[PDB]
Curated annotation (Swiss-Prot):
Source superkingdom: Eukaryota
Tissues with expression: Expressed in the brain cortex (at protein level). Widely expressed with the highest level of expression in the brain (nerve fibers, varicosities, and nerve endings). In the brain, the regions where it can be mainly found are the cerebellar cortex, the neocortex, the striatum, and the hippocampal formation.
Modified residues (N6-acetyllysine): K82, K140
Organism: Homo sapiens (Human)
Stated name of the protein: Huntingtin
Domain notes for this protein: The N-terminal Gln-rich and Pro-rich domain has great conformational flexibility and is likely to exist in a fluctuating equilibrium of alpha-helical, random coil, and extended conformations.
Family: Belongs to the huntingtin family.
Amino acid sequence: TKKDRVNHCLTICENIVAQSVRNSPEFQKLLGIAMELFLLCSDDAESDVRMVADECLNKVIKALMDSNLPRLQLELYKEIKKNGAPRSLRAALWRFAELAHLVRPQKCRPYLVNLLPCLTRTSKRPEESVQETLAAAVPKIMASFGNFANDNEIKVLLKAFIANLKSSSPTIRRTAAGSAVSICQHSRRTQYFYSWLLNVLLGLLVPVEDEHSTLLILGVLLTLRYLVPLLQVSPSAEQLVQVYELTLHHTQHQDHNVVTGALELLQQLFRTPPPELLQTLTAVGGIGQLTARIKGDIGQSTDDDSAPLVHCVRLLSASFLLTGGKNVLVPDRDVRVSVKALALSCVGAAVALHPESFFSKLYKVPLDTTEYPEEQYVSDILNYIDHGDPQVRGATAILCGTLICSILSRSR
């Protein structure tokens, strides 16, 4: 009956729209029963059956978004609480984020309380396909159901997703990170909930000379690429400078999945910087007032008589893409050319902030004139125009663009 199952689902659809009679005590009973039956047609495993009868459920909704919206959204909340099959629960979750901004604010507050028991179970599910669509609904649901919750309901929901940063799947790590940050745009207080996510994560990396379970090191740095775009009681000016020393230790912590995680976080905090953090780095003393492969004295980000952005260009160069003795390329065998690509785009976004870093010497205390004849400056960054692939000769194409943009605007 595999061809007999196809004809059954499609004839139920057309005889609802062609009724032209809604809000009737006969019409109310008919729409509840055969609405759950549209998804068993998708639950049955055949691509001739799964593709055909899922486009037919969308014919019902859109012809009824005017007439029967409160009857549509009551049958649909029932299936998530049923917590069904990972194919059945998935394609119902597309339907419920697009009708979230169609509810009325009269009936909205009953719909908020019932979802938080239902939105934690689908966070505990290890199916890698079920976890994906929730990172495309927690953007859409909690922006229209955002304002209707108090400070009690939203503190429970964010302790669950951080326990979904403790899993080892790359598909499940990036769906729990975009869920914590879409709530705080819409929670109740947009600025109060930005300062609260920064306290929870830095105790997961409280003092850095520990064993930090290097899968869990990657969970904390992906929630911070989504929230620095939103940082522009408040998040304090001493709360944001604890974020910044945490990464320079983690551009050195060896891996190829943990070195690439803290280098997308640094390219974005210079492009859209938080304005409290942005004045503490251009300043001359810098971090010294807030406290009161490399083989030389760089001078750490606590020292005075130099800005910290003078410090931060000496550090990302002699570890990744430069050797302190001579103008010479580093081999692609040592550092990957996916890892050398994100290190040329971080030296360029700081020159737009502090342009005096690019003219500095690489080592502060010079390095061993017996071994090496001459000491070099950071201008061998601009010898990576001849290096091989795109996005290195193209990301030293963009390193000369914002070095000229920001000397003219620095000295007038």
